[PDB]
Write an enzyme that holds these catalytic residues in place. Structure first.
Site, short mmCIF file in Angstrom:
data_model
loop_
_atom_site.label_atom_id
_atom_site.label_comp_id
_atom_site.label_asym_id
_atom_site.label_seq_id
_atom_site.Cartn_x
_atom_site.Cartn_y
_atom_site.Cartn_z
N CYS A 205 0.82 -1.18 0.00
CA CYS A 205 0.00 0.00 0.00
C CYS A 205 0.85 1.23 0.00
CB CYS A 205 -0.95 0.07 1.21
SG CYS A 205 -1.85 -1.48 1.46
N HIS B 238 -9.35 1.74 -3.13
CA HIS B 238 -7.97 1.40 -2.82
C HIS B 238 -7.25 0.58 -3.90
CE1 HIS B 238 -4.50 1.07 -0.37
NE2 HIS B 238 -4.72 -0.16 0.04
N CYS C 201 -0.88 3.05 5.95
CA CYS C 201 -0.45 1.78 6.47
C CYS C 201 -0.10 0.80 5.38
CB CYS C 201 -1.51 1.16 7.40
SG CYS C 201 -3.12 0.67 6.59
N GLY D 151 0.61 -3.45 4.44
CA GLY D 151 0.62 -4.89 4.65
C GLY D 151 1.98 -5.40 5.05
C1 LIG Z 1 -14.03 -6.63 2.27
C2 LIG Z 1 -14.16 -7.41 0.96
C3 LIG Z 1 -13.70 -8.85 1.17
C4 LIG Z 1 -15.63 -7.44 0.55
O1 LIG Z 1 -15.75 -7.85 -0.78
P1 LIG Z 1 -17.22 -8.23 -1.36
O2 LIG Z 1 -18.05 -8.93 -0.29
O3 LIG Z 1 -17.04 -9.12 -2.58
O4 LIG Z 1 -17.90 -6.79 -1.74
P2 LIG Z 1 -19.51 -6.50 -1.78
O5 LIG Z 1 -19.82 -5.13 -2.35
O6 LIG Z 1 -20.25 -7.57 -2.57
O7 LIG Z 1 -19.96 -6.53 -0.24
C5 LIG Z 1 -21.14 -7.20 0.16
C6 LIG Z 1 -22.28 -6.21 0.30
O8 LIG Z 1 -21.81 -5.02 0.91
C7 LIG Z 1 -22.62 -3.99 0.37
N1 LIG Z 1 -22.08 -2.64 0.59
C8 LIG Z 1 -20.77 -2.26 0.76
N2 LIG Z 1 -20.75 -1.11 1.49
C9 LIG Z 1 -22.03 -0.77 1.78
C10 LIG Z 1 -22.60 0.29 2.47
N3 LIG Z 1 -21.95 1.45 2.48
N4 LIG Z 1 -23.98 0.33 2.60
C11 LIG Z 1 -24.79 -0.62 2.02
N5 LIG Z 1 -24.21 -1.66 1.33
C12 LIG Z 1 -22.86 -1.72 1.21
C13 LIG Z 1 -22.78 -4.30 -1.11
O9 LIG Z 1 -23.92 -3.68 -1.70
C14 LIG Z 1 -22.89 -5.81 -1.05
O10 LIG Z 1 -24.24 -6.21 -1.14
P3 LIG Z 1 -24.66 -7.55 -1.94
O11 LIG Z 1 -24.20 -8.76 -1.14
O12 LIG Z 1 -26.16 -7.62 -2.18
O13 LIG Z 1 -23.94 -7.52 -3.28
C15 LIG Z 1 -13.32 -6.79 -0.17
O14 LIG Z 1 -13.79 -5.51 -0.52
C16 LIG Z 1 -11.93 -6.64 0.33
O15 LIG Z 1 -11.08 -7.77 0.48
N6 LIG Z 1 -11.65 -5.38 0.60
C17 LIG Z 1 -10.61 -5.04 1.53
C18 LIG Z 1 -9.44 -4.68 0.64
C19 LIG Z 1 -8.19 -4.40 1.41
O16 LIG Z 1 -8.00 -4.91 2.54
N7 LIG Z 1 -7.34 -3.61 0.77
C20 LIG Z 1 -5.99 -3.49 1.23
C21 LIG Z 1 -5.97 -2.59 2.45
S1 LIG Z 1 -4.84 -3.27 3.67
#
Ligand SMILES: CC(C)(COP(=O)(O)OP(=O)(O)OC[C@H]1O[C@@H](n2cnc3c(N)ncnc32)[C@H](O)[C@@H]1OP(=O)(O)O)[C@@H](O)C(=O)NCCC(=O)NCCS
Ligand SMILES: CC(C)(COP(=O)(O)OP(=O)(O)OC[C@H]1O[C@@H](n2cnc3c(N)ncnc32)[C@H](O)[C@@H]1OP(=O)(O)O)[C@@H](O)C(=O)NCCC(=O)NCCS
Lengths: 391, 390, 391, 391
Positions: free
Chosen positions: C88, C347, C377, C379
């Site tokens: 990152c 990100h 931050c 990883g």
């Molecule tokens: C956290 C993570 C695993 C989630 O991925 P995902 O589940 O495939 O993403 P999704 O959008 O489908 O999340 C599930 C739900 O959250 C909902 N959503 C996300 N934020 C929301 C909020 N603000 N309000 C309402 N809904 C929200 C989506 O609409 C989705 O709904 P659905 O199941 O009907 O599709 C993924 O984004 C990830 O690994 N991110 C972290 C990345 C990271 O760590 N980056 C490096 C930094 S160290």
């Protein structure tokens, strides 16, 4: 009554996993054994109505490898060909289905048996949906589609553990049977008892063709002590090991079938008349018991008593199951797998049933046996059997 | 020995990656097996064996025919197995079941075919390992289902070969596809697939869905939309997406027993199997298969072509279908009267059992005495079966 | 003491996972940002000595995507280019490294930042030794190489849970922070505050080019209720959710660097002077705490107190860690991520450090802020921080 | 006027493709070299500020392998680490980047070099969109990301052919150069001249650990006839062969750096002072020419004439390009690759620049050479060179 004979028969050597036939397609092994049975009977490829080949692991080999083996062998396009899968039972089951084609007046001349390359079996994944994120598995079709019970999710070797426990078969007894199977097979090999049934196979190479005509999985000098060092392969407090189960192997085997009267018109001296066959189901957890009801139903349909049998081929999927079947049926163990069995020779799934048929037939000819039986257990909980009487 | 079809059922045929996109073949098979029992009033315990055609079983696990059987409630005592004569498999399986009974080896057989073209995986042989350089992950649906093993080309090239041989125009093949769509849409809307279809329930996380309509049939099929399509296999070709059948999913089966058995059980059978035959032809022109196979079937039944009241002749491609109609010379009005594979879809291992169902149920409906079902097969074969009504 | 300035800067809009940039290689985004920084500074591509682009996930993109990006942008073959990976941290660390090229007298003009296409990251397996039998995994490189801790084996989200526990941060506090990020980002976007920093990107099609100039991941009208209904994404009794974590995204971002004396010769009004930078390690288990020691160290090196800062960009990998950073440093939250952060904006890993640098620099300019700091931050347990002063 | 020295250095043996280190992750090799430079200098792991490791092929190895390497070697969590990629340039470039961290006062002690496992590089494909129907390619990342020119689509070996044609270099001249490299490397290995630079690597095994301390790619008794009979590997009427090209190889190599005044306080007798370095771009088509401007630029910056040099390591990507560099620079070929080069020893891409630095430094010490230069060509059209003087 029809009366159908096995005019001739042939098998490749059984190859070791990723060994001699490591890169050889099943149908190439197939074609060789098809040509073999033709030549051996003095029947021309143009006379064959249909080829039927058991095969369990045909993914990526292309359309209907039974037709690829047929066509490579020089069987004309006008003939037909198909494959089938009753798992370990397939190569013997194909023979019974060919017999039926003649019995029902739909074919005159059939080549039937099985082929398997466990080596050439691919890994696979369903990828149409497409993978939005995350790891996925590449699945070994050999293990998934060959060796894993679909209902209980575990390996065939766990079904052998179930039978072992059921019949209270010790580790020592299962090892004793393995070492005896190896020794019987090494003896027969050295004594030339597999020469008749084996048709050499030429593995075409870049820096040299290689002729394979010797079963390469048999271990020379198998001792009880080496058997006893091994670790259980499926259960950590288990009885079953790599040394007392058959292996993963490649090979093919076939038989030429026609009516008794047709063999006589042709001056052919058949290897046997197919007197009966039977297939039966059992619990998949103890699939290794299959041969017991199948062999009893076969004998019943022959109108034969168990004691009438002069020779038996009862496949050795695992020493645990083989010992159980022998124990139950009670036939003289000295007339069973006389030249050794699948633990030594190997277990090329779709071919196995025609492999052991070959071995029975040629030994029946050799010793002048009148009555023989071939039997196999079948993953998912079945058994198959066939009775053969010499002409 | 006189062996009858006591009962028959099929799933609706799904579109590729459509209704059954994530349904294993053997779950479609199990629904079809249970339906044949139910319709005949025969207990699952009474089935000796289940024989299912299937061309594309990779990754589905040991012996999916046994998986279907068990899920259908056929006891562990019975037996089951799969077989592959490619597109003939589902009909051939019925001949094979008939044989078990005619040789006295079984009393009751369920037989048919099942196919999930959607669930077919990609694969590669990787035990040697790839030391260096790119390699192919192979679509087993294409490699193992639609590609000729001898010439290396897609079945649609063989259909081009037949089009040039029989001098079949792009207009003629389009006419046949529009005609097949119109027939199949009419039939559907008229309720003529209702009897033969058993609904299948696609189990879902946010809702079960019952499938009981063939979803590949296109409504309001015009010659225009057909005539705009580009050839699919030869850039100067005549075969297209619209005048060839599709990639599809489905299952279909028949319950077989002797005629004497059916009468002991008070079952009014769908027909008696009078003959069948399979023959080989040049792979290049595999679509021609149904010609020698229907003549031999007809010669074995002791029937003339003119004797037939109804015919199911599988439409793999417009070109091969038109060719088989032209040579056999049977009245095209009695051929695929409720449409064909172009409209309905072509779930490989299941097709032969699919067209058998349509024939049987339409025979009963219109009161036809003599019917024939036939298919071409990749690699150069034909299968056919002659049916007479009781 | 050498003094390096940021002459100009630009970033693409940040694309949603498998959204606007779903099939756009990272180096195409990069090339657009290179062109943009050149055009904004009034500096010709001929003049660039080196391009330095952070990138975590380049697998399958080909030889050195940084060079690919430079050449597409018209940077001459006599220049050089290289990629780097501090996770990152990468897009910010590239900036510091390009300042060091000038400071040691090795280059006069550098383009530096980062680029990332998480969308285009492939699945992979080591297959040279072959898979003799049994299943194997096709690994998602984005997860394996971007998001999974190499020491403890868990996702970055679990490190977030560890920080939530250590600092006793409620689900309600994290969710509120997340909703505030969306709402600030939405406001800034609507008011036009991302216009200056964004260079539009043309996605070339087949049935039409599409110009992308708006951050697509920002949720409009984000409610607390919708945040509150989500299930924890990493720990079933957890507090970190898809809603209060950043996303998976695509983008690029860069800065054009030269000496302060050289900008003066050219008549360039630079976006800022690099006064200090720092990178420090922490425990991998709480990597989200990295910005704490990095920022303190950056400030010490600048001779500034925390109270001296007028604006801060602290990257929101996760609400838990963002909150922990703000709590420990004690800076006025009203000067932090004034236009929203990565929870809303996204990100794109290797691009994120230069993405928040862009945002900081154009906001400092808009509001007349004299002193700023950007921090992330990292990883594996690191932090990076940079101090910028206005000219 | 900052003066940075190389306090200590080390490399692993260079393994053959899918050879000794066939299943060894690059960071494991890196960790052993980190440990070795520390032990060799008398510096403790606690004292390291940063680890900087060039690596071209990290796919599937997980988050930031340089950090993995560092952590394994016991470098504390408070230190930092990152990877970089300027292709074949990387392992040498890292040493310059390491120098700069000290020169700009941002660090005191750096471990820098490179690491590469070409063997462990995976095959990949972008599968998120999902494969509607049809075959698709699994891409070899070592070929795609390491060996293929991104602009012209062809292998590095074609660029060598382009250089062969331009400088009219015969097949006989390239084969003689190749045999010479083998024979020099063999003599050096036999006489023990790689001992000092090599740290042995323990390959952990199930049925036995294997200590690897000899370069396994060097062919013993290499003959001209053997070279002469090979077929051209990239062009059918070409001149470049597998024999007169470098190989595909695994290894790691590093240097511990500090200020000259720091080495003095500790009583360390350094391997050399970094007097200058440079990197320059060329036409991708003739990338093997990169050493020419890079070495001239490095020499200009040191204030040295080509004739002042006492020892040169000029990396042997291909005989064709090695020959062209030697012809253009005109340096005495007897002072170049005195102990053999990459044709014999191998080319673990991201490690190579550091590997050749090790060889230069330990040979300078052995023979008492005062002035040395290391240089490499670089895919995509670049060169890197470094000048070293003895203390
Ligand atoms: C956290 C993570 C695993 C989630 O991925 P995902 O589940 O495939 O993403 P999704 O959008 O489908 O999340 C599930 C739900 O959250 C909902 N959503 C996300 N934020 C929301 C909020 N603000 N309000 C309402 N809904 C929200 C989506 O609409 C989705 O709904 P659905 O199941 O009907 O599709 C993924 O984004 C990830 O690994 N991110 C972290 C990345 C990271 O760590 N980056 C490096 C930094 S160290
Ligand atoms: C050149 C290259 C394509 C050859 O690939 P390869 O065919 O897999 O290599 P191999 O070792 O299997 O084939 C070479 C053959 O020549 C022989 N050979 C190799 N070096 C030899 C020598 N010095 N003398 C005689 N024979 C030699 C080998 O024994 C082999 O013969 P064999 O197959 O009968 O055993 C490959 O090594 C390569 O891509 N190297 C270049 C690396 C590169 O570009 N690095 C980056 C630079 S920018």
């Amino acid at each position: 009554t029809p009366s159908i004979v096995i005019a001739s028969a042939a098998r490749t050597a059984v190859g070791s996993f990723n060994g001699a036939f490591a890169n050889t397609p099943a149908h190439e092994l197939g074609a060789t054994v098809i040509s073999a049975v033709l030549e051996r009977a003095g029947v021309a490829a143009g006379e064959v109505n249909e080829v039927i080949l058991g095969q369990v692991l045909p993914a990526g080999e292309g359309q209907n490898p039974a037709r690829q083996a047929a066509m490579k062998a020089g069987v004309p396009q006008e003939a037909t060909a198909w494959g089938m899968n009753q798992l370990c039972g397939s190569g013997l089951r194909a023979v019974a289905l060919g017999m039926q084609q003649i019995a029902t007046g739909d074919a005159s001349i059939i080549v039937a048996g099985g082929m398997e390359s466990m080596s050439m079996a691919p890994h696979c994944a369903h990828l149409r949906g497409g993978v939005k994120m995350g790891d996925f598995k590449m699945i070994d079709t050999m293990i998934k589609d060959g060796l894993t019970d679909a209902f209980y999710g575990y390996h065939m070797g766990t079904t052998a553990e179930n039978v072992a426990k059921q019949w209270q078969l010790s580790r020592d007894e299962q090892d004793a049977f393995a070492v005896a199977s190896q020794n019987k097979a090494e003896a027969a090999q050295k004594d030339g008892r597999f020469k008749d049934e084996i048709v050499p196979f030429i593995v075409k190479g870049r820096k040299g063709d290689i002729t394979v005509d010797a079963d390469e999985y048999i271990r020379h000098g198998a001792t009880l002590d080496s058997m006893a060092k091994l670790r259980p392969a499926f259960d950590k407090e288990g009885t079953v090991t790599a040394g007392n189960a058959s292996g993963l192997n490649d090979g093919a085997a076939a038989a030429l079938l026609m009516s008794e009267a047709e063999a006589s018109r042709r001056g052919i001296q058949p290897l046997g008349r197919i007197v009966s066959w039977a297939t039966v189901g059992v619990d998949p957890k103890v699939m290794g018991t299959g041969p017991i009801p199948a062999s009893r139903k076969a004998l019943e349909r022959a109108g034969w008593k168990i004691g009438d049998l002069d020779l038996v081929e009862a496949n050795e999927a695992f020493a645990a199951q083989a010992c159980a079947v022998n124990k139950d049926l009670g036939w003289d163990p000295s007339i069973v797998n006389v030249n050794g069995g699948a633990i030594a020779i190997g277990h090329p799934i779709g071919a196995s049933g025609a492999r052991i048929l070959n071995t029975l037939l040629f030994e029946m000819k050799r010793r002048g046996a009148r009555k023989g039986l071939a039997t196999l257990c079948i993953g998912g909980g079945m058994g198959v059997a066939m009775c053969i009487e010499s002409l």
